[PDB]
Design a protein around this ligand. Structure first.
Ligand SMILES: CC(C)CN(C[C@@H](O)[C@H](Cc1ccccc1)NC(=O)O[C@@H]1C[C@@H]2CCO[C@@H]2C1)S(=O)(=O)c1ccc(CO)cc1
Ligand SMILES: [Cl-]
Ligand SMILES: [Cl-]
Ligand SMILES: [Cl-]
Ligand SMILES: [Cl-]
Ligand SMILES: [Cl-]
Ligand SMILES: [Cl-]
Ligand SMILES: [Cl-]
Ligand SMILES: [Cl-]
Ligand code: NA
Ligand SMILES: [Zn+2]
Ligand SMILES: [Zn+2]
Ligand SMILES: [Zn+2]
Ligand SMILES: [Zn+2]
Ligand SMILES: [Zn+2]
Ligand SMILES: [Zn+2]
Ligand SMILES: [Zn+2]
Ligand SMILES: [Zn+2]
Ligand SMILES: [Zn+2]
Lengths: 99, 99
């Protein structure tokens, strides 16, 4: 696949079997999703961007299916306004950003 | 050029001659830069990031030098913790996300 960035690069992923729309985001080190519950085994952490900061719950070794690939990766949950697949997942998939 | 995403895709750029560190950000619609001073010829814009909304100053037809190219694009200045070149500039540069 190629994403020409004329539009937001948004795709459907399955996280622990739940479908979610996610933004493929080179400007995110990590990945953060809203609307899914991953359980009591997490590490709380704060992240920051435009507009401020949010509390998140960091989960390791989460099953992710996206772009017809299956990977296991770290996912934060929190009250993000958009679901973000950052570089930890993009690299796991073998994605690159090219000029 | 190629960004393999194991590290942040950060580069240096000039905005009307002013040097900046910028993050190539496929998750950003717009390009938002802090600290540079582009003058009084702007319109206010409202931008929503992970944490909430900020006001920005929108400047059109700004000269930008990055990745050995020169383009004219819209820059918004405001309080972002990381300067980001979003898809308005990535498309002007002819960049893409690939797997
Ligand atoms: C500002 C970047 C340095 C870090 N962001 C990733 C960006 O692509 C971030 C992703 C995002 C967030 C909220 C709504 C829509 C998209 N785009 C971003 O702010 O773009 C700004 C805000 C506006 C809406 C999208 O385009 C306009 C320009 S982020 O704050 O979301 C973030 C911060 C920390 C982590 C954890 O590593 C993940 C994401
Ligand atoms: Cl499986
Ligand atoms: Cl190329
Ligand atoms: Cl890299
Ligand atoms: Cl490297
Ligand atoms: Cl210059
Ligand atoms: Cl926009
Ligand atoms: Cl606006
Ligand atoms: Cl916005
Ligand atoms: Na526990
Ligand atoms: Zn499975
Ligand atoms: Zn499946
Ligand atoms: Zn909320
Ligand atoms: Zn090329
Ligand atoms: Zn590298
Ligand atoms: Zn110049
Ligand atoms: Zn830096
Ligand atoms: Zn915008
Ligand atoms: Zn505009």
């Amino acid at each position: 696949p190629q994403f020409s960035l004329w539009k937001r690069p948004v795709v459907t992923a399955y996280i622990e079997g739940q479908p979610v729309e996610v933004l493929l985001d080179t400007g995110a080190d990590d990945s953060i999703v809203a609307g899914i519950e991953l359980g009591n085994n997490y590490s709380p952490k704060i992240v920051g961007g435009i507009g401020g900061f949010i509390n998140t719950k960091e989960y390791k070794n989460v099953e992710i299916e996206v772009l017809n690939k299956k990977v296991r990766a770290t996912i934060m949950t929190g009250d993000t306004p958009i679901n973000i697949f950052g570089r930890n997942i993009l690299t796991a998939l073998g994605m690159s950003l090219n000029l």
